[PDB]
Amino acid sequence: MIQRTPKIQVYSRHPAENGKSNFLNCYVSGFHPSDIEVDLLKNGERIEKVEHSDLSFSKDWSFYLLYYTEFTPTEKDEYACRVNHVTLSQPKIVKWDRDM
Amino acid sequence: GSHSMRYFFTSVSRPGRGEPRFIAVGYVDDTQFVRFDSDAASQRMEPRAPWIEQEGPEYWDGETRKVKAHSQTHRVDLGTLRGCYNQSEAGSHTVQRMYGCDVGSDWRFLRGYHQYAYDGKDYIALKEDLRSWTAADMCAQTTKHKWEAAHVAEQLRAYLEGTCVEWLRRYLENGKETLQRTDAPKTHMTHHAVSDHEATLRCWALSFYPAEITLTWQRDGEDQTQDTELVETRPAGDGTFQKWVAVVVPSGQEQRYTCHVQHEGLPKPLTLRWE
Numbered sequence: 439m440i441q442r443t444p445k446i447q448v449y450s451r452h453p454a455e456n457g458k459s460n461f462l463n464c465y466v467s468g469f470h471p472s473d474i475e476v477d478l479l480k481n482g483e484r485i486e487k488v489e490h491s492d493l494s495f496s497k498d499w500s501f502y503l504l505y506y507t508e509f510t511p512t513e514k515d516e517y518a519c520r521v522n523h524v525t526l527s528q529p530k531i532v533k534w535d536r537d538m
Numbered sequence: 539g540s541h542s543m544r545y546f547f548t549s550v551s552r553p554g555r556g557e558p559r560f561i562a563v564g565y566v567d568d569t570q571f572v573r574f575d576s577d578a579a580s581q582r583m584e585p586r587a588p589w590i591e592q593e594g595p596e597y598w599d600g601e602t603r604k605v606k607a608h609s610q611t612h613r614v615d616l617g618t619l620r621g622c623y624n625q626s627e628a629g630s631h632t633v634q635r636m637y638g639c640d641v642g643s644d645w646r647f648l649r650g651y652h653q654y655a656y657d658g659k660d661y662i663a664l665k666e667d668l669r670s671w672t673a674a675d676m677c678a679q680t681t682k683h684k685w686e687a688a689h690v691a692e693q694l695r696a697y698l699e700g701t702c703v704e705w706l707r708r709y710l711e712n713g714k715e716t717l718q719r720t721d722a723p724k725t726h727m728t729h730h731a732v733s734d735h736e737a738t739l740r741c742w743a744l745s746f747y748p749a750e751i752t753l754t755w756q757r758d759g760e761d762q763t764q765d766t767e768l769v770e771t772r773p774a775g776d777g778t779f780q781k782w783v784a785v786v787v788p789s790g791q792e793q794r795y796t797c798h799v800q801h802e803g804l805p806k807p808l809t810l811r812w813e
Protein backbone atom coordinates (compact mmCIF):
# COMPACT_ATOMS: atom_id res chain seq x y z
CA MET A 439 0.00 0.00 0.00
CA ILE A 440 2.97 2.33 0.76
CA GLN A 441 4.55 3.60 -2.38
CA ARG A 442 7.72 5.61 -2.90
CA THR A 443 8.70 7.38 -6.15
CA PRO A 444 12.18 6.76 -7.69
CA LYS A 445 14.81 9.43 -7.49
CA ILE A 446 16.65 9.23 -10.79
CA GLN A 447 20.17 10.39 -11.54
CA VAL A 448 22.00 10.07 -14.85
CA TYR A 449 25.77 10.62 -14.82
CA SER A 450 29.19 9.48 -16.02
CA ARG A 451 31.58 7.57 -13.75
CA HIS A 452 34.43 9.92 -14.72
CA PRO A 453 34.47 13.48 -16.09
CA ALA A 454 33.34 13.17 -19.67
CA GLU A 455 35.81 13.97 -22.46
CA ASN A 456 34.57 13.39 -26.01
CA GLY A 457 36.05 10.26 -27.68
CA LYS A 458 37.43 8.82 -24.41
CA SER A 459 35.79 5.66 -23.02
CA ASN A 460 33.70 6.07 -19.88
CA PHE A 461 30.78 4.46 -18.02
CA LEU A 462 27.23 5.82 -18.11
CA ASN A 463 25.18 5.30 -14.98
CA CYS A 464 21.52 5.60 -14.09
CA TYR A 465 21.03 5.41 -10.38
CA VAL A 466 17.52 4.91 -9.11
CA SER A 467 16.97 5.16 -5.33
CA GLY A 468 14.10 5.70 -2.83
CA PHE A 469 11.46 3.51 -4.51
CA HIS A 470 8.89 1.10 -3.20
CA PRO A 471 7.72 -1.43 -4.35
CA SER A 472 10.79 -2.94 -6.09
CA ASP A 473 9.27 -3.77 -9.55
CA ILE A 474 10.91 -1.12 -11.83
CA GLU A 475 11.78 -0.64 -15.47
CA VAL A 476 15.04 1.16 -16.27
CA ASP A 477 16.61 1.66 -19.69
CA LEU A 478 19.50 3.69 -20.89
CA LEU A 479 18.81 5.60 -24.11
CA LYS A 480 21.15 6.81 -26.86
CA ASN A 481 19.44 9.46 -29.10
CA GLY A 482 16.02 8.42 -27.68
CA GLU A 483 16.72 4.68 -28.49
CA ARG A 484 17.10 1.81 -26.00
CA ILE A 485 20.71 0.67 -25.38
CA GLU A 486 20.85 -3.14 -25.41
CA LYS A 487 23.84 -4.35 -23.33
CA VAL A 488 23.09 -2.62 -19.97
CA GLU A 489 24.03 -4.25 -16.61
CA HIS A 490 22.56 -3.59 -13.17
CA SER A 491 23.41 -4.05 -9.54
CA ASP A 492 21.83 -6.52 -7.13
CA LEU A 493 18.59 -5.19 -5.48
CA SER A 494 19.30 -3.65 -2.11
CA PHE A 495 17.57 -1.13 0.17
CA SER A 496 18.26 1.82 2.52
CA LYS A 497 17.41 2.24 6.22
CA ASP A 498 13.92 3.60 5.35
CA TRP A 499 13.36 0.29 3.42
CA SER A 500 13.33 2.00 0.05
CA PHE A 501 15.11 0.24 -2.75
CA TYR A 502 18.05 1.29 -4.98
CA LEU A 503 19.58 -0.02 -8.21
CA LEU A 504 22.40 1.12 -10.43
CA TYR A 505 22.12 0.54 -14.16
CA TYR A 506 25.37 1.03 -16.14
CA THR A 507 27.20 0.49 -19.43
CA GLU A 508 30.51 1.41 -21.06
CA PHE A 509 30.20 4.36 -23.39
CA THR A 510 32.37 6.78 -25.35
CA PRO A 511 30.89 10.28 -24.96
CA THR A 512 30.87 12.33 -28.19
CA GLU A 513 29.75 15.85 -29.09
CA LYS A 514 26.63 14.82 -31.07
CA ASP A 515 25.24 11.83 -29.13
CA GLU A 516 22.49 12.34 -26.51
CA TYR A 517 22.06 9.94 -23.55
CA ALA A 518 19.15 9.52 -21.17
CA CYS A 519 17.60 7.12 -18.64
CA ARG A 520 13.99 6.06 -18.88
CA VAL A 521 12.19 4.74 -15.84
CA ASN A 522 8.73 3.35 -15.18
CA HIS A 523 7.30 2.46 -11.85
CA VAL A 524 3.82 2.13 -10.36
CA THR A 525 4.31 5.68 -8.86
CA LEU A 526 4.78 7.32 -12.33
CA SER A 527 1.70 8.11 -14.46
CA GLN A 528 4.00 8.05 -17.53
CA PRO A 529 7.65 6.91 -18.01
CA LYS A 530 10.08 9.52 -16.72
CA ILE A 531 13.02 10.38 -18.92
CA VAL A 532 16.03 12.15 -17.44
CA LYS A 533 18.69 13.45 -19.93
CA TRP A 534 22.46 13.15 -19.25
CA ASP A 535 23.82 16.66 -18.76
CA ARG A 536 27.63 16.65 -18.72
CA ASP A 537 27.96 20.39 -17.99
CA MET A 538 26.30 20.30 -14.51
CA GLY B 539 37.83 3.04 12.93
CA SER B 540 34.34 1.54 13.22
CA HIS B 541 32.68 -0.85 10.70
CA SER B 542 29.52 -2.74 9.97
CA MET B 543 28.28 -5.93 8.31
CA ARG B 544 24.75 -6.09 6.93
CA TYR B 545 22.61 -8.63 5.12
CA PHE B 546 19.51 -7.47 3.26
CA PHE B 547 16.81 -9.87 2.14
CA THR B 548 13.95 -9.02 -0.18
CA SER B 549 11.08 -11.40 -0.94
CA VAL B 550 8.35 -10.55 -3.38
CA SER B 551 5.21 -12.57 -4.03
CA ARG B 552 3.97 -13.04 -7.56
CA PRO B 553 0.86 -15.18 -6.97
CA GLY B 554 -0.15 -17.75 -9.66
CA ARG B 555 3.05 -16.73 -11.49
CA GLY B 556 5.15 -19.20 -9.43
CA GLU B 557 7.06 -18.78 -6.22
CA PRO B 558 8.33 -15.47 -4.76
CA ARG B 559 11.43 -13.64 -5.98
CA PHE B 560 14.06 -13.75 -3.22
CA ILE B 561 17.21 -11.56 -3.38
CA ALA B 562 19.81 -11.50 -0.62
CA VAL B 563 22.85 -9.20 -0.57
CA GLY B 564 25.71 -8.78 1.97
CA TYR B 565 27.75 -5.63 2.68
CA VAL B 566 30.73 -4.63 4.69
CA ASP B 567 30.37 -0.88 5.25
CA ASP B 568 29.54 0.49 1.76
CA THR B 569 31.04 -2.52 -0.11
CA GLN B 570 28.81 -5.38 -1.37
CA PHE B 571 30.46 -8.79 -1.22
CA VAL B 572 27.76 -11.52 -1.83
CA ARG B 573 24.47 -12.06 -3.60
CA PHE B 574 21.79 -14.71 -4.01
CA ASP B 575 18.95 -14.41 -6.56
CA SER B 576 16.33 -17.21 -6.44
CA ASP B 577 15.52 -16.68 -10.18
CA ALA B 578 19.23 -17.07 -11.23
CA ALA B 579 20.57 -20.30 -12.84
CA SER B 580 23.41 -21.07 -10.38
CA GLN B 581 21.18 -21.39 -7.27
CA ARG B 582 24.36 -20.49 -5.33
CA MET B 583 25.43 -17.68 -3.10
CA GLU B 584 27.90 -15.87 -5.28
CA PRO B 585 30.93 -13.62 -4.64
CA ARG B 586 30.67 -9.98 -5.57
CA ALA B 587 33.91 -8.71 -4.03
CA PRO B 588 37.43 -9.85 -4.91
CA TRP B 589 38.43 -10.44 -1.21
CA ILE B 590 35.55 -12.97 -0.60
CA GLU B 591 36.67 -15.27 -3.50
CA GLN B 592 39.38 -16.91 -1.27
CA GLU B 593 36.69 -18.50 1.02
CA GLY B 594 36.66 -22.30 0.62
CA PRO B 595 33.80 -24.66 -0.43
CA GLU B 596 32.42 -25.13 3.14
CA TYR B 597 31.75 -21.35 3.22
CA TRP B 598 29.95 -21.32 -0.14
CA ASP B 599 28.01 -24.52 0.57
CA GLY B 600 27.12 -23.22 4.02
CA GLU B 601 25.98 -19.79 2.90
CA THR B 602 23.93 -21.24 0.06
CA ARG B 603 22.11 -23.62 2.52
CA LYS B 604 21.52 -20.77 4.99
CA VAL B 605 20.17 -18.26 2.41
CA LYS B 606 17.90 -20.86 0.69
CA ALA B 607 16.58 -21.67 4.21
CA HIS B 608 15.90 -17.90 4.65
CA SER B 609 14.12 -17.78 1.32
CA GLN B 610 11.89 -20.65 2.54
CA THR B 611 10.95 -18.96 5.82
CA HIS B 612 10.08 -15.65 3.95
CA ARG B 613 8.03 -17.76 1.46
CA VAL B 614 5.98 -19.04 4.47
CA ASP B 615 5.78 -15.51 6.06
CA LEU B 616 4.33 -14.03 2.85
CA GLY B 617 1.32 -16.42 3.34
CA THR B 618 1.07 -15.70 7.06
CA LEU B 619 1.14 -11.97 6.59
CA ARG B 620 -1.45 -11.96 3.81
CA GLY B 621 -3.58 -13.97 6.24
CA CYS B 622 -3.09 -11.61 9.14
CA TYR B 623 -3.78 -8.38 7.11
CA ASN B 624 -6.72 -10.00 5.27
CA GLN B 625 -5.24 -9.34 1.81
CA SER B 626 -6.27 -10.97 -1.48
CA GLU B 627 -4.41 -13.98 -2.82
CA ALA B 628 -3.60 -12.50 -6.20
CA GLY B 629 -1.65 -9.33 -5.25
CA SER B 630 2.15 -8.82 -4.86
CA HIS B 631 3.48 -8.01 -1.38
CA THR B 632 6.99 -7.54 -0.08
CA VAL B 633 8.89 -8.73 2.91
CA GLN B 634 12.30 -7.31 3.79
CA ARG B 635 14.78 -8.38 6.46
CA MET B 636 18.01 -6.71 7.47
CA TYR B 637 20.46 -7.79 10.12
CA GLY B 638 24.01 -7.18 11.07
CA CYS B 639 26.50 -5.92 13.58
CA ASP B 640 28.63 -2.87 14.20
CA VAL B 641 32.11 -2.96 15.68
CA GLY B 642 33.98 -0.08 17.23
CA SER B 643 37.43 1.35 16.52
CA ASP B 644 39.16 -1.63 18.24
CA TRP B 645 36.85 -4.02 16.26
CA ARG B 646 34.88 -5.11 19.37
CA PHE B 647 31.06 -5.69 19.23
CA LEU B 648 29.21 -2.33 19.46
CA ARG B 649 25.63 -3.03 18.30
CA GLY B 650 23.39 -5.60 16.64
CA TYR B 651 20.33 -5.21 14.42
CA HIS B 652 17.62 -7.61 13.32
CA GLN B 653 14.50 -6.24 11.66
CA TYR B 654 11.61 -6.83 9.36
CA ALA B 655 9.37 -4.76 7.16
CA TYR B 656 6.15 -5.76 5.31
CA ASP B 657 5.08 -3.73 2.27
CA GLY B 658 7.76 -1.08 3.05
CA LYS B 659 6.67 -0.45 6.67
CA ASP B 660 8.44 -1.46 9.85
CA TYR B 661 6.94 -4.76 11.07
CA ILE B 662 9.05 -6.15 13.94
CA ALA B 663 12.57 -5.31 15.04
CA LEU B 664 14.93 -6.38 17.75
CA LYS B 665 15.53 -3.70 20.34
CA GLU B 666 19.04 -2.37 20.93
CA ASP B 667 19.42 -4.66 23.98
CA LEU B 668 18.90 -7.74 21.69
CA ARG B 669 16.45 -9.22 24.30
CA SER B 670 13.14 -7.42 23.44
CA TRP B 671 11.07 -6.57 20.32
CA THR B 672 9.50 -3.42 18.82
CA ALA B 673 6.20 -4.24 17.07
CA ALA B 674 3.85 -1.40 16.08
CA ASP B 675 0.77 -2.90 14.57
CA MET B 676 -1.48 -5.76 15.77
CA CYS B 677 -0.24 -8.44 13.36
CA ALA B 678 3.35 -7.84 14.52
CA GLN B 679 2.25 -7.85 18.14
CA THR B 680 0.98 -11.36 17.44
CA THR B 681 4.37 -12.27 15.93
CA LYS B 682 6.04 -10.82 19.04
CA HIS B 683 4.06 -13.06 21.45
CA LYS B 684 5.10 -16.07 19.44
CA TRP B 685 8.75 -15.09 19.21
CA GLU B 686 8.90 -14.21 22.94
CA ALA B 687 7.40 -17.63 23.77
CA ALA B 688 9.93 -19.46 21.53
CA HIS B 689 12.92 -17.40 22.86
CA VAL B 690 13.83 -16.21 19.36
CA ALA B 691 16.01 -13.23 20.45
CA GLU B 692 18.62 -15.15 22.48
CA GLN B 693 19.45 -17.24 19.34
CA LEU B 694 19.75 -14.02 17.22
CA ARG B 695 21.78 -12.25 19.99
CA ALA B 696 24.28 -15.19 19.98
CA TYR B 697 24.86 -14.75 16.22
CA LEU B 698 24.99 -10.94 16.45
CA GLU B 699 27.49 -10.74 19.38
CA GLY B 700 29.67 -13.64 18.20
CA THR B 701 29.54 -15.16 14.71
CA CYS B 702 28.59 -11.83 13.00
CA VAL B 703 31.53 -9.95 14.55
CA GLU B 704 34.05 -12.82 13.92
CA TRP B 705 33.19 -12.83 10.23
CA LEU B 706 33.37 -8.99 10.03
CA ARG B 707 36.92 -8.96 11.59
CA ARG B 708 37.97 -11.68 9.13
CA TYR B 709 36.56 -9.72 6.16
CA LEU B 710 38.18 -6.50 7.40
CA GLU B 711 41.65 -8.08 7.29
CA ASN B 712 41.24 -10.15 4.09
CA GLY B 713 39.66 -7.15 2.31
CA LYS B 714 42.07 -4.60 3.85
CA GLU B 715 42.85 -3.10 0.34
CA THR B 716 39.21 -2.22 -0.21
CA LEU B 717 37.61 -1.95 3.21
CA GLN B 718 40.39 -0.27 5.27
CA ARG B 719 40.78 2.74 2.97
CA THR B 720 39.48 6.24 2.90
CA ASP B 721 39.26 8.12 -0.39
CA ALA B 722 38.93 11.90 0.18
CA PRO B 723 36.40 13.61 -2.18
CA LYS B 724 37.68 15.61 -5.14
CA THR B 725 35.66 18.86 -4.69
CA HIS B 726 34.76 21.88 -6.80
CA MET B 727 31.85 24.25 -7.58
CA THR B 728 30.15 24.97 -10.92
CA HIS B 729 28.27 28.04 -11.98
CA HIS B 730 25.56 28.13 -14.69
CA ALA B 731 23.59 31.19 -15.75
CA VAL B 732 19.99 29.98 -15.95
CA SER B 733 18.88 33.51 -16.95
CA ASP B 734 20.12 37.13 -16.81
CA HIS B 735 19.01 37.52 -13.21
CA GLU B 736 19.88 34.20 -11.45
CA ALA B 737 22.48 31.40 -11.40
CA THR B 738 22.71 27.78 -10.19
CA LEU B 739 25.69 27.18 -7.94
CA ARG B 740 26.48 23.46 -7.54
CA CYS B 741 28.96 22.01 -5.07
CA TRP B 742 30.52 18.71 -6.15
CA ALA B 743 32.24 15.87 -4.22
CA LEU B 744 33.65 13.06 -6.35
CA SER B 745 35.61 9.83 -6.05
CA PHE B 746 35.07 9.44 -2.22
CA TYR B 747 34.82 6.37 0.15
CA PRO B 748 33.17 5.68 2.50
CA ALA B 749 29.75 7.06 1.39
CA GLU B 750 29.17 9.15 4.52
CA ILE B 751 29.58 12.89 3.58
CA THR B 752 28.04 16.28 4.37
CA LEU B 753 27.68 19.13 1.80
CA THR B 754 26.18 22.42 2.96
CA TRP B 755 25.79 25.93 1.55
CA GLN B 756 26.13 29.16 3.58
CA ARG B 757 25.23 32.75 2.56
CA ASP B 758 27.25 35.32 4.53
CA GLY B 759 27.87 32.41 6.90
CA GLU B 760 24.19 31.54 7.47
CA ASP B 761 23.06 27.96 6.76
CA GLN B 762 20.99 27.75 3.56
CA THR B 763 19.30 24.32 4.19
CA GLN B 764 15.81 25.24 2.92
CA ASP B 765 17.08 26.65 -0.36
CA THR B 766 19.58 23.74 -0.98
CA GLU B 767 18.92 20.98 -3.50
CA LEU B 768 20.69 17.92 -2.15
CA VAL B 769 20.89 14.76 -4.32
CA GLU B 770 21.28 11.19 -2.89
CA THR B 771 24.90 10.06 -2.57
CA ARG B 772 25.38 7.81 -5.59
CA PRO B 773 27.79 4.98 -6.66
CA ALA B 774 30.36 5.98 -9.40
CA GLY B 775 30.53 2.25 -10.11
CA ASP B 776 34.30 1.81 -9.21
CA GLY B 777 33.74 1.53 -5.43
CA THR B 778 33.65 5.30 -4.84
CA PHE B 779 30.76 7.70 -4.41
CA GLN B 780 29.52 11.00 -5.78
CA LYS B 781 27.23 13.76 -4.37
CA TRP B 782 26.29 17.35 -5.14
CA VAL B 783 24.24 20.19 -3.53
CA ALA B 784 22.94 23.16 -5.50
CA VAL B 785 21.49 26.60 -4.68
CA VAL B 786 19.85 29.03 -7.09
CA VAL B 787 21.07 32.57 -6.41
CA PRO B 788 20.73 36.13 -7.83
CA SER B 789 23.37 36.99 -10.42
CA GLY B 790 26.16 38.93 -8.68
CA GLN B 791 25.76 37.49 -5.16
CA GLU B 792 28.03 34.37 -5.82
CA GLN B 793 30.76 35.61 -3.45
CA ARG B 794 28.23 35.52 -0.52
CA TYR B 795 27.84 31.75 -1.08
CA THR B 796 30.26 29.15 0.32
CA CYS B 797 30.21 25.36 0.13
CA HIS B 798 31.26 23.24 3.08
CA VAL B 799 32.31 19.65 2.76
CA GLN B 800 32.88 17.13 5.59
CA HIS B 801 34.39 13.69 5.00
CA GLU B 802 36.50 11.09 6.97
CA GLY B 803 39.34 11.44 4.33
CA LEU B 804 39.60 15.28 4.73
CA PRO B 805 42.16 16.47 7.36
CA LYS B 806 39.95 19.51 8.17
CA PRO B 807 36.45 20.57 6.96
CA LEU B 808 36.70 22.16 3.50
CA THR B 809 35.25 25.57 2.50
CA LEU B 810 34.97 26.41 -1.22
CA ARG B 811 34.50 29.96 -2.32
CA TRP B 812 33.71 32.17 -5.25
CA GLU B 813 36.61 34.64 -5.04
Ligand SMILES: [Cl-]
Binds near residue numbers: 441443444468
Ligand atom coordinates in the same frame (compact mmCIF):
# COMPACT_ATOMS: atom_id res chain seq x y z
CL1 LIG C 1 8.37 9.19 -2.55
Ligand SMILES: [Cl-]
Binds near residue numbers: 538742
Ligand atom coordinates in the same frame (compact mmCIF):
# COMPACT_ATOMS: atom_id res chain seq x y z
CL1 LIG D 1 30.88 19.20 -12.81
Ligand SMILES: [Cl-]
Binds near residue numbers: 545562605
Ligand atom coordinates in the same frame (compact mmCIF):
# COMPACT_ATOMS: atom_id res chain seq x y z
CL1 LIG E 1 22.49 -15.86 4.68
Ligand code: NA
Binds near residue numbers: 439440
Ligand atom coordinates in the same frame (compact mmCIF):
# COMPACT_ATOMS: atom_id res chain seq x y z
NA1 NA F 1 2.64 5.74 0.66
Ligand code: NA
Binds near residue numbers: 446447448532
Ligand atom coordinates in the same frame (compact mmCIF):
# COMPACT_ATOMS: atom_id res chain seq x y z
NA1 NA G 1 18.10 13.89 -12.09
Ligand code: NA
Binds near residue numbers: 564572583
Ligand atom coordinates in the same frame (compact mmCIF):
# COMPACT_ATOMS: atom_id res chain seq x y z
NA1 NA H 1 27.89 -14.59 2.93
Ligand code: NA
Binds near residue numbers: 615618619681
Ligand atom coordinates in the same frame (compact mmCIF):
# COMPACT_ATOMS: atom_id res chain seq x y z
NA1 NA I 1 5.37 -13.83 10.12
Ligand code: NA
Binds near residue numbers: 499632
Ligand atom coordinates in the same frame (compact mmCIF):
# COMPACT_ATOMS: atom_id res chain seq x y z
NA1 NA J 1 8.47 -4.61 2.78
Ligand code: NA
Binds near residue numbers: 719720
Ligand atom coordinates in the same frame (compact mmCIF):
# COMPACT_ATOMS: atom_id res chain seq x y z
NA1 NA K 1 42.88 -0.04 1.56
Ligand code: NA
Binds near residue numbers: 808810
Ligand atom coordinates in the same frame (compact mmCIF):
# COMPACT_ATOMS: atom_id res chain seq x y z
NA1 NA L 1 39.05 25.15 3.67
Ligand code: NA
Binds near residue numbers: 806
Ligand atom coordinates in the same frame (compact mmCIF):
# COMPACT_ATOMS: atom_id res chain seq x y z
NA1 NA M 1 39.98 23.67 4.94
